[PDB]
C-alpha cells in the first residue's frame, strides 16, 4: 500500500530535470510514473525543484485549497513546473499530453508527521 507522501513524489516530483525540454516530456513521464496504467490521468504537474525545497513549502504561507479546505501552502518563491494536459485526440489505451513548462508559485496540500505534501493543488 503506497504512502500518500510517496505517491505525491511519484505523481508530481522531477528533481532530476531543471525543466521539460521536449514536447513529449509529459507523454514519456505520465507513462513512466504509472500515470496512464489503468486510465489516462487527465492533468498532472511535475515540479523541477529539490525534494527539500518542495517539502519546505509546508512551512510557508497557509492558503485555502481550491475545494476550499485549508491545509494548503503556497511557495514563497517561484518554482519550475511542467503542466501536462491530455490532447483532444488522447484516448486510453493510447494517451497523449500537451507539455507546458513555466516558472510559477505552487500550492500543495500537506499532511502527517513528517508534515509533507500529499496533493498538488495549483500554481500561480
Amino acid at each position, epitope marked *: 500500500k503506497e504512502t500518500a507522501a510517496a505517491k505525491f513524489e511519484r505523481q508530481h516530483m522531477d528533481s532530476s530535470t531543471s525543466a521539460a525540454s521536449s514536447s513529449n516530456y509529459c507523454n514519456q513521464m505520465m507513462k513512466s510514473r504509472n500515470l496512464t496504467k489503468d486510465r489516462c490521468k487527465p492533468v498532472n504537474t511535475f515540479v523541477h525543484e529539490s525534494l527539500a525545497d518542495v517539502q519546505a513549502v*509546508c*512551512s510557508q*504561507k*497557509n*492558503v*485555502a485549497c481550491k475545494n476550499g*479546505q*485549508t*491545509n494548503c*501552502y503556497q511557495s514563497y518563491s517561484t518554482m519550475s513546473i511542467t503542466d501536462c494536459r491530455e490532447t483532444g485526440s488522447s484516448k486510453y489505451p493510447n494517451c497523449a499530453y500537451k507539455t507546458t513548462q513555466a516558472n510559477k508559485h505552487i500550492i500543495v*496540500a*500537506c*499532511e*502527517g508527521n513528517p*508534515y509533507v505534501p500529499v496533493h498538488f493543488d495549483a500554481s500561480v
Partner: nanobody, 121 residues
Framework: QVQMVESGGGLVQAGGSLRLSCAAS????????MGWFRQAPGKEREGVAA????????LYADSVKGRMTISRDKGKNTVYLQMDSLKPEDTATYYC??????????????WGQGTQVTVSS
C-alpha cells in the same frame, strides 16, 4: 522555528471550569485554522474544537458540545478554550494545533507538547 506555547491546564474539581490558551510564535503569516485535540491515557488522540482566522467555521466534538467554547483573536495566531461542567471523561493532555482543516488530525502541521488536565470526581 515556530514555537507553540500552551497554558491554563492543571487540576480542577468535577463540574468546575478551566481556561486554556495557546499562541503560535515565529510563524510569518496567519494560520487559517487552529484547533484543540485531547489524548487521554491509553487512547487515540481526538478532536475537541476548531475555529478559523475570521471567527467562523467553528466546530465542536459530540462529547463536549455545550460545555466548551473556542475563541480566537481576529486574524492572529492565538486560540482559547473555555471549558466548563468538566468531568473525569475530560481528563487528558489537551493539545493545540495550527495549519490544518477543521478537526482532521492529519491536516495540522504544528503541535504543542500539551497541558495535562486532571478532573477529580
Amino acid at each position: 522555528q515556530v514555537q507553540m506555547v500552551e497554558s491554563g491546564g492543571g487540576l480542577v474539581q468535577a463540574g468546575g471550569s478551566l481556561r486554556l490558551s495557546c499562541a503560535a510564535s515565529g510563524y510569518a503569516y496567519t494560520y487559517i485554522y487552529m484547533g484543540w485535540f485531547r489524548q487521554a491515557p491509553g487512547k487515540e488522540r481526538e478532536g475537541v474544537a476548531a475555529m478559523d482566522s475570521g471567527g467562523g467555521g467553528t466546530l465542536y466534538a459530540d462529547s463536549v458540545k455545550g460545555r466548551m467554547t473556542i475563541s480566537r483573536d481576529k486574524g492572529k495566531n492565538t486560540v482559547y478554550l473555555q471549558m466548563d461542567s468538566l468531568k473525569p471523561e475530560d481528563t487528558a493532555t489537551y493539545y493545540c494545533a495550527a495549519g490544518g482543516y477543521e478537526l482532521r488530525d492529519r491536516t495540522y502541521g504544528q503541535w504543542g507538547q500539551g497541558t495535562q488536565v486532571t478532573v477529580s470526581s
